[PDB]
Design a protein around this nucleic acid. Structure first.
Ligand SMILES: [Ca+2]
Ligand SMILES: [Ca+2]
Ligand SMILES: [Cl-]
Length: 669
DNA sequence: GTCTGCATTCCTC
DNA sequence: GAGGAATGCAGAC
């Protein structure tokens, strides 16, 4: 037998990897249960002809925010031991168990939409940081999902990322020698018959079969070279789709990208470099100090990198002396030693970012700008970072005494200090009338950070966490309603709500966290064989019962009522393809109920339950508690009314399964 | 309060 | 109009 571990942000992310495996593996025997209170497992017996295989996958829901926050040891430490110095967490880490220790097989991130603008690079720090470790990084994204006007659920025009973002994965793979890729899955809202923007999309770009093939070959310790080349080719076809749909005058053409991909030229030595310049756009309200004159100096010498208006460009070594002279004259830099450092004979990448909002809080999208530059040009390129947004007094003080202390506590400063050779600030200081100018020679510090790794040590996460919390409530709720209780229907979660009626599945995508009167439920369960009408049970999970907010029960029902007011995003016949939603659903065709789930170690009296029902308005309370000897989840269902009591009686009678080991549970009533 | 994930409006060319 | 610049809320701590 071989054992694998799936460490994920939550149970749903863990299960998404299992769905990928099960899509290609047709198992002869499947068993589910728990290895510990926190860790569910799936055991499979399958064959490749005459060759049988016995695999077990142990799931670890919820990552630590330090070394012993939830789990006894942090699986993420294996990434920082190989150079992942940014505070970045993928969605899933798959490991192999061998000689009492875990070995990382791959890191996987799931995205529900191909994001555009600066949202495309907001989390590029993950791909950069994990990518430099040698462990494969797979970024899976749905192509396409529409952005909505939340007041009427009407679709906004499709937006696509700059071709440089999908390209950055390919160039980071070439620079590091590791497998870093962007893979695309067909979204339910991919409807080329209705949207002209998708006229030239190549459907061979979709990678569902190839991702499952890759994962299974990795689990089998087989050669993945050819599967990796097919996936890299699809990532390149996406760059081609995007670059052929943008204007050539201020952006790289596909022939330019192709000449970099095939190794004819480097991104900084393209013969056509300079046909467009680097022209940073700065809002007039963001201007202060000498920022406008610095931007004029950059535009006097720069050559464009991928796009004229991306926040970075190049100053070729042939123009670096004159660029440095103009900067030094503008800011009165006279120190001979400093000027010599600035005038090193090499190409210079200039990145300009506001960095901070009017109160001094950091810009999230700016965190991925230097990682994007490093993925495109290499982390060893010389980078000059210019910042012009407002700094709080505490920030400028740390810059003047210990910049690494500031990098340690803030993710944006960590990005800047790890990847910049020179940091130039021309910033307003909150509470003061005029700007501060700083020129930081960060070369030595950058070099040391690029060699930093955490303590070398083997890891085998203990399946018993420090204590049981919200992640554990969700794992327990999900397992009972997905594998034990008979209802087939997909139900709902944060990524969308599916409702099955007749022989059709109706789905609402792009769910907002809240509506005018509703709150998005953590789980939605559909039960069809209890009443004449289908039952929709909306559940909110919390660590403790007092965490259940006032009117949360009423808010869960109102959220479902909000979705019923609109035509579902998509629909399909369960027997037959996804189409855009055509018919509206009817709320009276369903019974709606709400539930609050939490952990309680027998601290609630009859009066406490009466008060929780009054505060929340829930129809059902699900009190969960672990028993340690022997390990069991003890479940207490408290119905507020007769409809909820019928549901409880149904759950109790149907608490049987051929796949799931129900012996790990005890349903009090 | 600070940090980070999420995602929508604003503004330049 | 295209698309990058710029922005704040929320949850956990
Ligand atoms: Ca065989
Ligand atoms: Ca919850
Ligand atoms: Cl194409």
């Amino acid at each position: 037998m071989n054992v694998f571990r799936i460490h994920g942000d939550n149970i749903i992310e863990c299960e998404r990897v299992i769905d990928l495996i099960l899509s290609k593996i047709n198992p002869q025997k499947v068993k589910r249960g728990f290895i510990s209170l926190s860790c569910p497992f799936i055991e499979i017996i399958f064959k490749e002809g005459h060759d049988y295989f016995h695999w077990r996958f142990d799931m670890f829901p919820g990552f630590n925010k330090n070394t012993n926050d939830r789990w006894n040891s942090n699986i993420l430490d294996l990434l920082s031991q190989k150079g992942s110095f940014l505070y970045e967490t993928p969605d899933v880490i798959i490991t192999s168990l061998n000689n009492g220790k875990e070995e990382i097989l791959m890191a996987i991130v799931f995205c529900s939409a191909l994001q555009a603008g600066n949202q495309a690079w907001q989390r590029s720090g993950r791909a950069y940081s994990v990518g430099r470790t040698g462990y494969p990084y797979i970024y899976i994204v749905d192509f396409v999902k529409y952005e909505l006007n939340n007041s009427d659920r009407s679709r906004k025009n499709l937006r696509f990322p700059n071709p440089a973002i999908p390209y950055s994965y390919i160039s980071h793979s070439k620079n590091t020698g590791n497998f870093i890729v962007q893979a695309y899955f067909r979204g339910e809202e991919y409807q080329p018959k209705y949207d002209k923007k998708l006229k030239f999309f190549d459907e061979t770009i979709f990678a569902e079969d190839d991702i499952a093939d890759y994962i299974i070959a990795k689990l089998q310790h087989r050669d993945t070279s050819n599967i990796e080349q097919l996936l890299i080719n699809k990532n390149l076809k996406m760059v081609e789709f995007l670059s052929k749909n943008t204007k050539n005058d201020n952006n790289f053409t596909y022939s330019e990208w192709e000449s970099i991909y095939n190794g004819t030229y480097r991104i900084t030595n393209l013969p056509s470099l300079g046909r467009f310049k680097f022209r940073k756009k700065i809002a007039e309200k963001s201007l202060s100090g000498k920022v406008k004159e610095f931007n004029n100096i950059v535009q006097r010498y720069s050559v464009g990198l991928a796009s004229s208006d991306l926040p970075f460009g190049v100053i070729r070594k042939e123009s670096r002396n004159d660029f440095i002279n103009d900067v030094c004259k503008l800011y009165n830099i006279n120190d001979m030693k400093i000027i010599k450092e600035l005038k090193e004979d090499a190409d210079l990448i200039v990145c300009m970012l506001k960095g901070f909002k009017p109160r001094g809080d950091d810009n999230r999208p700016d965190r991925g700008a230097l990682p994007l530059v490093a993925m495109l040009a290499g982390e060893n390129a010389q980078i000059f970072t210019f910042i012009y947004g407002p700094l709080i007094k505490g920030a400028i003080n740390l810059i003047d005494q210990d910049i690494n202390k500031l990098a340690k506590r803030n993710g944006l400063w960590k990005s800047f200090v790890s990847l910049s050779d020179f940091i130039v600030l021309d910033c307003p200081i909150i509470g003061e009338s005029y700007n501060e100018f700083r020129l930081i020679i960060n070369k030595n510090n950058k070099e040391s950070i690029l060699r930093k790794t955490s303590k070398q040590q083997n890891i085998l996460v203990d399946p018993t966490p420090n204590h049981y919390q919200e992640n554990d409530v969700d794992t327990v709720i999900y397992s009972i309603f997905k594998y034990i209780v008979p209802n087939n229907p997909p139900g709902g979660d944060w990524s969308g709500l599916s409702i099955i009626r007749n022989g059709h599945e109706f789905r609402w995508l792009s769910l907002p966290r809240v509506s005018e009167n509703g709150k998005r439920p953590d789980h939605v369960i559909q039960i069809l064989d209890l009443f004449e009408k289908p039952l929709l049970l909306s559940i909110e999970s919390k660590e403790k019962p007092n965490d259940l907010e006032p009117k949360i029960g009423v808010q869960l029902i109102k959220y479902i009522e909000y979705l019923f007011d609109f035509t579902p995003s998509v629909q399909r016949k369960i027997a037959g393809n996804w189409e855009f939603g055509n018919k509206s659903l009817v709320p009276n065709d369903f019974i709606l109920l709400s539930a609050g789930a939490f952990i309680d170690y027998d601290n609630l009296t009859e009066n406490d339950y009466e008060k929780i029902f009054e505060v929340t308005g829930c129809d059902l309370l699900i009190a969960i508690k672990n028993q340690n000897n022997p390990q069991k989840w003890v479940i207490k269902f408290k119905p507020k009314n007769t409809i909820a009591e019928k549901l409880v009686n149904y759950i109790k009678l149907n608490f049987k399964s051929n796949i799931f080991d129900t012996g790990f549970f005890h349903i009090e009533g």
